[PDB]
Amino acid sequence: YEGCGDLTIFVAVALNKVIGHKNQIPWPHITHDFRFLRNGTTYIPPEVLSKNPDIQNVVIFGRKTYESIPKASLPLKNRINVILSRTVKEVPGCLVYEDLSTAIRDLRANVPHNKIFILGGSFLYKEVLDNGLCDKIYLTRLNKEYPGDTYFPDIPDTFEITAISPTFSTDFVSYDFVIYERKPFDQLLMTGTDISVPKPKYVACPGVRIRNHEEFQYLDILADVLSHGVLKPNRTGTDAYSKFGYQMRFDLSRSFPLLTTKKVALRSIIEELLWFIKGSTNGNDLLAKNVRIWELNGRRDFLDKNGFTDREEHDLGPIYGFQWRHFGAEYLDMHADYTGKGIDQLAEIINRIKTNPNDRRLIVCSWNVSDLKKMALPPCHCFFQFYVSDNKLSCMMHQRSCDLGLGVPFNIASYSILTAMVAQVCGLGLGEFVHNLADAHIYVDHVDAVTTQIARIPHPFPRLRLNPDIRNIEDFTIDDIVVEDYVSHPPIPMA
Amino acid sequence: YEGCGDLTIFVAVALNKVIGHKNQIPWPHITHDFRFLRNGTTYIPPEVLSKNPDIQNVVIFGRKTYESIPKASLPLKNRINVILSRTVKEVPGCLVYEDLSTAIRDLRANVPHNKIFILGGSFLYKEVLDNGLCDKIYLTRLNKEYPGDTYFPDIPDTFEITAISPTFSTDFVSYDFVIYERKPFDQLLMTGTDISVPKPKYVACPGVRIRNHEEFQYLDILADVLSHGVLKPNRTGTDAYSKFGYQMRFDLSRSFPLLTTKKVALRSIIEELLWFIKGSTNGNDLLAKNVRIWELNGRRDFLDKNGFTDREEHDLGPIYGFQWRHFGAEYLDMHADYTGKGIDQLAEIINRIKTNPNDRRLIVCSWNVSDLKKMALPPCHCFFQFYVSDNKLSCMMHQRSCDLGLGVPFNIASYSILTAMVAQVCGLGLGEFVHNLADAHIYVDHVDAVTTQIARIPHPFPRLRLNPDIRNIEDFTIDDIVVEDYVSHPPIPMAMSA
Ligand SMILES: NC(=O)c1ccc[n+]([C@@H]2O[C@H](COP(=O)([O-])OP(=O)(O)OC[C@H]3O[C@@H](n4cnc5c(N)ncnc54)[C@H](OP(=O)(O)O)[C@@H]3O)[C@@H](O)[C@H]2O)c1
Numbered sequence: 001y002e003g004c005g006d007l008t009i010f011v012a013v014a015l016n017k018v019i020g021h022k023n024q025i026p027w028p029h030i031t032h033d034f035r036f037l038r039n040g041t042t043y044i045p046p047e048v049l050s051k052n053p054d055i056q057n058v059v060i061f062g063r064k065t066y067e068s069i070p071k072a073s074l075p076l077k078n079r080i081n082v083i084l085s086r087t088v089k090e091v092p093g094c095l096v097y098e099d100l101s102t103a104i105r106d107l108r109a110n111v112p113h114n115k116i117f118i119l120g121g122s123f124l125y126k127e128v129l130d131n132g133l134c135d136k137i138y139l140t141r142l143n144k145e146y147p148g149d150t151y152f153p154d155i156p157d158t159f160e161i162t163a164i165s166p167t168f169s170t171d172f173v174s175y176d177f178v179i180y181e182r183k184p185f186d187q188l189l190m191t192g193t194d195i196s197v198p199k200p201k202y203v204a205c206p207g208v209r210i211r212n213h214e215e216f217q218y219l220d221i222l223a224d225v226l227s228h229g230v231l232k233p234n235r236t237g238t239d240a241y242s243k244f245g246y247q248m249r250f251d252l253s254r255s256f257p258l259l260t261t262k263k264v265a266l267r268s269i270i271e272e273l274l275w276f277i278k279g280s281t282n283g284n285d286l287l288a289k290n291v292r293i294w295e296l297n298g299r300r301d302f303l304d305k306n307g308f309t310d311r312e313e314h315d316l317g318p319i320y321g322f323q324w325r326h327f328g329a330e331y332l333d334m335h336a337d338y339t340g341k342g343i344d345q346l347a348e349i350i351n352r353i354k355t356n357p358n359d360r361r362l363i364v365c366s367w368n369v370s371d372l373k374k375m376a377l378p379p380c381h382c383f384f385q386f387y388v389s390d391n392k393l394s395c396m397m398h399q400r401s402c403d404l405g406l407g408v409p410f411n412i413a414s415y416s417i418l419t420a421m422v423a424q425v426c427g428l429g430l431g432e433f434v435h436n437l438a439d440a441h442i443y444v445d446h447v448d449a450v451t452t453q454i455a456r457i458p459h460p461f462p463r464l465r466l467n468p469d470i471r472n473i474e475d476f477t478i479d480d481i482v483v484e485d486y487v488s489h490p491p492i493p494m495a
Numbered sequence: 496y497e498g499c500g501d502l503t504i505f506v507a508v509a510l511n512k513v514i515g516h517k518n519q520i521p522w523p524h525i526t527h528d529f530r531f532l533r534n535g536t537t538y539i540p541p542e543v544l545s546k547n548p549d550i551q552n553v554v555i556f557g558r559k560t561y562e563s564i565p566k567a568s569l570p571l572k573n574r575i576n577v578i579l580s581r582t583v584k585e586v587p588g589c590l591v592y593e594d595l596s597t598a599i600r601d602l603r604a605n606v607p608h609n610k611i612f613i614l615g616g617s618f619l620y621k622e623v624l625d626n627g628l629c630d631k632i633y634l635t636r637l638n639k640e641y642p643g644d645t646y647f648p649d650i651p652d653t654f655e656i657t658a659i660s661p662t663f664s665t666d667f668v669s670y671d672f673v674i675y676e677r678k679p680f681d682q683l684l685m686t687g688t689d690i691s692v693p694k695p696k697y698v699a700c701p702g703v704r705i706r707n708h709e710e711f712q713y714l715d716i717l718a719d720v721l722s723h724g725v726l727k728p729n730r731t732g733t734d735a736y737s738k739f740g741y742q743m744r745f746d747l748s749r750s751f752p753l754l755t756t757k758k759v760a761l762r763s764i765i766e767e768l769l770w771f772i773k774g775s776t777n778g779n780d781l782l783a784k785n786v787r788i789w790e791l792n793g794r795r796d797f798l799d800k801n802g803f804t805d806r807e808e809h810d811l812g813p814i815y816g817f818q819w820r821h822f823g824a825e826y827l828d829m830h831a832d833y834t835g836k837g838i839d840q841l842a843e844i845i846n847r848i849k850t851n852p853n854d855r856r857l858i859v860c861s862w863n864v865s866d867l868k869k870m871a872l873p874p875c876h877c878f879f880q881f882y883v884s885d886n887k888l889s890c891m892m893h894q895r896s897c898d899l900g901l902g903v904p905f906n907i908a909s910y911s912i913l914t915a916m917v918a919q920v921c922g923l924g925l926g927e928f929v930h931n932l933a934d935a936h937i938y939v940d941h942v943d944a945v946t947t948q949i950a951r952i953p954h955p956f957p958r959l960r961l962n963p964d965i966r967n968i969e970d971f972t973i974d975d976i977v978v979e980d981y982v983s984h985p986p987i988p989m990a991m992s993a
């Protein structure tokens with residue numbers, strides 16, 4: 001295989017590694033992937049094009065893949081098409097070779113071209129990888145298994161992912177684009193400070209250089225806090241490393257930001273959010289769903305410790321649910337009837353959005369200063385604001401205190417669901433969830449867990465499908481809130 | 496001067512162009528300037544260091560600059576030292592030549608080196624600039640005038656600034672660094688969007704490639720909203736271009752972020768803040784001090800159309816001052832005595848910081864949901880949070896509605912002052928102000944004004960000095976709050992909408 005190196009693969013691959021089914025693409029057409037491939041395989045570096053505007057890229061197929069592309073526009077526009085086979089003679093306007101070894105040498109010695117791309121057949125992928133002729137793989141990752149009979153071979157441990165696109169979705173699949181690859185001083189000087197700054201002790205996925213997956217926002221914050229956070233002790237309790245002031249954003253029209261670097265407990269997230277929506281302050285309602293994230297905060301021991309000796313177990317006081325639905329009402333206990341008492345911020349914001357989406361006062365505030373002394377924990381996600389433009393709903397949330405290990409992944413998914421529900425009930429499209437972190441911290445007993453997590457390569461985000469028949473926010477149940485195509489690394493226990 | 500070009504200058508220059516006084520530097524030691532010069536003139540690119548591990552840069556001095564240097568400090572370590580002189584013939588560890596052109600030609604022919612730098616003095620700087628021999632100037636900008644007898648030449652209009660550092664400060668000056676210069680496809684593909692995208696229509700300071708001055712955060716947001724904001728109707732009747740969700744941050748230990756690309760009305764900012772702190776909602780208090788920023792919001796027409804027909808003119812309702820000092824009290828009018836009524840959020844947060852810097856309640860909230868029906872205009876900077884780490888105070892503020900042209904420059908300065916005050920009264924150093932913008936918009940009648948603004952090169956930020964005797968936040972007066980070394984471009988008229 002002398003002179004046959006530096007071959008570049010383009011391929012789209014289902015979760016079970018299937019690439020073909022009965023000589024056809026196993027999934028419905030993804031126009032975005034057609035365009036991606038077209039763009040990747042037609043690019044000529046300007047300085048090459050400027051000395052001969054004729055120069056073109058080579059695109060190589062196995063026989064069956066050629067016969068699989070519609071017999072109409074088979075010669076792919078603006079590219080040299082090459083097909084390989086030990087049986088077929090010659091193809092209309094396409095170079096035909098017996099084997100790959102000979103194909104590459106003939107093109108590289110005789111035919112003026114820029115770059116060679118390997119575009120399909122498991123047979124052709126196999127030879128290329130098995131011998132080491134590929135330096136680069138552009139791979140479209142699909143988060144769903146499909147029936148098929150043709151598969152992409154395993155990628156040798158000699159490759160690593162160096163690039164991940166943002167996550168995208170169609171009505172039927174979520175997906176992204178990745179690149180696998182084998183294996184200026186003024187910018188430093190003009191910080192005005194130390195030119196030889198020690199490398200941060202922690203870096204998320206240090207092999208990935210083009211980092212466009214939205215999950216890197218969260219992983220980078222994890223690495224930042226471990227690297228630079230100040231230790232905040234607490235007597236009676238677990239210490240944490242802390243750093244202040246971050247902003248993340250998630251495009252909710254593209255995908256649903258359920259973290260993939262660990263298996264996140266979606267069911268608990270949804271049940272907690274439905275409980276907020278109903279205005280509940282009764283921790284038993286969550287326990288009945290075997291959701292235990294609020295349990296420790298409702299216990300006899302914890303309540304007494306905080307002065308609420310007269311308060312029934314799992315009566316959490318005037319927390320989120322109460323503020324969302326009854327801001328300003330006098331809190332009694334979790335059993336009281338608050339109908340028509342206080343301000344229903346959630347109802348009012350939905351009505352306001354419908355009535356005047358340009359209102360600059362679309363806010364729900366859970367920071368009820370007068371009520372703080374009746375909660376054992378002050379609200380954490382304490383203020384959010386909606387915004388409408390081009391008929392798309394966005395949301396910005398202020399998180400006072402951010403448990404990065406356990407809490408923040410819940411908040412990201414929770415507010416994303418809430419934004420989608422509100423958009424649906426108000427007849428709006430989806431914009432962005434913008435997440436402001438104030439005190440962002442990592443508990444010291446989570447250090448090892450998050451060190452493990454930041455090394456893991458994000459999978460494409462899943463996508464959210466709400467039941468389209470739900471007209472009112474109070475009508476959503478867990479069965480109406482469906483996350484599709486969630487692919488995650490294993491769960492990481494955190495106390 | 497054949498073969499004598501591409502000489503790089505390092506210099507530190509006062510606001511009046513002074514660089515020397517009685518053959519010494521006119522100002523005392525500037526910490527980051529010393530490191531900048533040392534780092535800038537010793538650096539060898541790793542690849543160049545591969546092909547010659549012993550390679551060094553050259554630094555060149557004229558005779559008077561040479562004599563200003565303690566003989567024991569020469570040669571400057573890790574660099575080839577060249578002195579230009581007809582009167583000194585030999586300097587241990589240094590090369591001596593009679594003039595510049597002889598030096599550069601002999602260096603480039605016979606003395607292997609990486610880059611040549613010119614370190615002064617004025618005579619050499621003038622020879623270099625007059626003869627077109629310099630392609631790059633690393634210049635330290637000091638934001639105040641110094642007495643002196645020695646000057647840096649005017650920089651030819653063939654140069655432009657291509658890089659600006661963050662602002663730094665000592666006890667005596669604020670300063671920054673600038674560079675003047677004479678004049679991959681996968682990254683595009685892997686966005687997953689159009690590979691060929693038209694350039695944004697608006698770009699702040701397009702000649703500046705390294706953009707580390709904190710003011711660029713604000714200028715970039717103006718340019719982003721002008722480029723991509725949606726035209727959006729609002730309460731005022733003057734439409735604005737609007738985009739959602741930004742975060743800026745300012746290191747308050749280094750400088751005070753009073754914008755330099757227009758002259759900002761600092762006196763108005765200070766008077767407004769003192770008014771918040773005293774808990775006042777009486778707009779006449781500000782008008783009596785010739786501060787008119789709240790005027791339109793207090794007028795009869797405004798109050799009536801928001802249904803406050805029984806409200807006295809310039810009674811601004813239960814806004815910031817009231818919420819900061821009296822949260823939950825019953826608002827009557829601007830004349831009532833609210834002493835010991837409602838929750839004094841400002842006093843409590845200061846006490847909490849002193850008692851426990853890690854308190855879970857370090858918030859001042861001006862969004863009193865129960866009070867919304869009593870307000871003609873609800874608080875825009877409606878929520879802020881303090882945070883302590885390493886005995887330094889930081890602040891994060893949520894701004895629901897951001898008039899980018901007129902309002903945001905005030906907010907930036909106002910919260911930075913407030914953070915400095917709280918830090919002083921709690922015995923803390925300074926961290927960062929983090930400013931979160933929700934609906935950020937440019938009124939249509941400010942578009943031309945901000946277009947003018949974003950083409951202006953920022954000056955180093957000034958610095959803030961509070962009267963250290965003040966121990967209680969209520970005791971600050973305007974005379975206690977002093978901004979030093981403020982250099983700005985001219986003011987830019989912008990009309991207020993209400
Ligand atoms: N999702 C994707 O990214 C993607 C991309 C491309 C293709 N596909 C799918 O994959 C399937 C087709 O792939 P396939 O593996 O069945 O067939 P293939 O590799 O396209 O072609 C097989 C035939 O081509 C010839 N050939 C292939 N590799 C050769 C080599 N290395 N050396 C010499 N000859 C070689 C052989 O010739 P003879 O038998 O003629 O002697 C062989 O029978 C289709 O279902 C297609 O839709 C999917």
Ligand SMILES: NC(=O)c1ccc[n+]([C@@H]2O[C@H](COP(=O)([O-])OP(=O)(O)OC[C@H]3O[C@@H](n4cnc5c(N)ncnc54)[C@H](OP(=O)(O)O)[C@@H]3O)[C@@H](O)[C@H]2O)c1
Pocket residue numbers: 505506507508513514515516517518519520556557558559560561563579580581582583593594595596614615616617618619620622645
């Ligand atoms: N703020 C800053 O960054 C900075 C930087 C540099 C200097 N400075 C200050 O500026 C002052 C020194 O500058 P300066 O203008 O007074 O003097 P200078 O340029 O340092 O030195 C003047 C002397 O240098 C010699 N010289 C320079 N170019 C020559 C050439 N082409 N051929 C022959 N001789 C040449 C002459 O030598 P002979 O007369 O011996 O023949 C002349 O008397 C000091 O106060 C210093 O602290 C400040």
